[PDB]
Symmetry: D2
Subunit: 118 residues, 4 copies
Amino acid sequence: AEAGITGTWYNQLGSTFIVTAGADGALTGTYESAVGNAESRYVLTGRYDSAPASGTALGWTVAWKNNYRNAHSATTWSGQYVGGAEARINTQWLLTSGTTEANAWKSTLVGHDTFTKV
Amino acid sequence: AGITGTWYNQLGSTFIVTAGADGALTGTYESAVGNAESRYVLTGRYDSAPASGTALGWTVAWKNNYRNAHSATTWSGQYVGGAEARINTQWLLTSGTTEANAWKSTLVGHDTFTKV
Amino acid sequence: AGITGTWYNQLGSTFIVTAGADGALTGTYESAVGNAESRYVLTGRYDSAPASGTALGWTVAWKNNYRNAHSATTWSGQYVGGAEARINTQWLLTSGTTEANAWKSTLVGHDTFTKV
Amino acid sequence: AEAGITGTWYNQLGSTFIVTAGADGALTGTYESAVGNAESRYVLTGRYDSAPASGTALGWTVAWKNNYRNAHSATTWSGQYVGGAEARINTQWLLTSGTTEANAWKSTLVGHDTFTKV
Ligand SMILES: O=C(O)c1ccccc1/N=N/c1ccc(O)c2ccccc12
Ligand SMILES: O=C(O)c1ccccc1/N=N/c1ccc(O)c2ccccc12
Ligand SMILES: O=C(O)c1ccccc1/N=N/c1ccc(O)c2ccccc12
Ligand SMILES: O=C(O)c1ccccc1/N=N/c1ccc(O)c2ccccc12
């Protein structure tokens, strides 16, 4: 929940996700990545189910552009928050890169990330 | 400017968005499926300084004042401007589930948005 | 019968398949992309006793007598027969990579096959 | 390789994959599933890179129909074989169910399976 989700998380790559869950279902924070043509932090925005039933559905987006670099790509993570002892966020993600129309067919990667809460 | 406006997917859903100078996407989404009749809030990000399509994404949690589906969809794609502007995406829809049903909680698909 | 035949995707690739009574799919795929000019073997499965589309899938490893891309694509979808028959799919393309590049080894997409 | 891939594997759900890798790049075997509207074994067919460079690219399909049941669906696994001490097959999969044209938009699931060799 609000409290549940809010905090600092890390994924299997060593990436850092700092998030605040608002009462209106908003997610806002920053993402600090370990891989790609990256550097420094990036702004994230998302939504979550503020009135869950076991898991809490959520998703967020990161556009890989900050004041220092631009990779012309964006990633969206879709998954669920599972509270308890070992609170975790289990996700599947899609990374799309800006391409020409000829290359569009191979513009999207798919993967999975597991986040653990500090 | 180009992204800002009203769009529609193949299902007939309506995506009304405002693109900020800074890279933010804000707006509302009115579904023609799953089961709705109502609008939902959406939030996202986009490359505000593109190179040729413009990368973007947004999320919608399927909960409003009237109903709660306990699910969320994320769209990831690119905006291709011109005379016949389009937003080409691939999406992931995840439902809240018990751990036993977790293996099959996510659906994958593709949507094409146009201004008509 | 219906599935057996010659099909084409949006890229112009050619899919020649034979559907067995038993559920097997066998054939050849000639790519119009990535970078080819040549054919590759394909193998798959299909529901040989459908209920309304017919579920199927097949894999192509991108290695023939001439080249080796060290990759493979799997297509998963459904055949929808009628006057204007189609095969609607979603695909995964995985390249062999070092463990360090493993996170980004798979591309996702969608293809539509028709008889024209 | 042929020898590398050939054998018995299990995934995180307790499913069993028995496979034989042919010299011509063919994969043939049987799959025995722990989840779904399933029972008994099902035939699998696939292809793999018979002349790899680190990982070996491969993929296979299962149509969920045997002499005992039919769920009118098929799954395709795409991934790589990584040899060594802890030989594993890392995959991403797509499961499509036969549906009417109205429901086609929500006909496909996406997930990930990790196979360990006995
Ligand atoms: O970092 C993660 O945890 C991460 C997790 C899941 C998917 C992608 C990720 N990272 N993606 C990038 C990070 C930094 C960059 O400069 C990039 C440049 C181009 C494309 C992707 C990236
Ligand atoms: O609407 C689209 O254009 C749409 C486009 C892509 C993916 C999903 C979509 N819609 N999904 C739902 C809409 C309304 C609901 O109440 C739901 C309840 C449970 C799961 C999904 C939905
Ligand atoms: O051809 C299609 O219709 C096609 C359709 C969907 C997905 C992939 C495809 N083709 N992919 C390749 C074709 C030829 C190659 O040498 C490759 C080398 C590396 C990676 C992919 C390919
Ligand atoms: O079993 C795995 O390891 C498995 C792993 C990945 C994806 C799917 C799986 N299993 N899928 C089914 C198994 C048995 C069934 O009767 C089904 C009926 C309908 C849809 C899926 C299945």
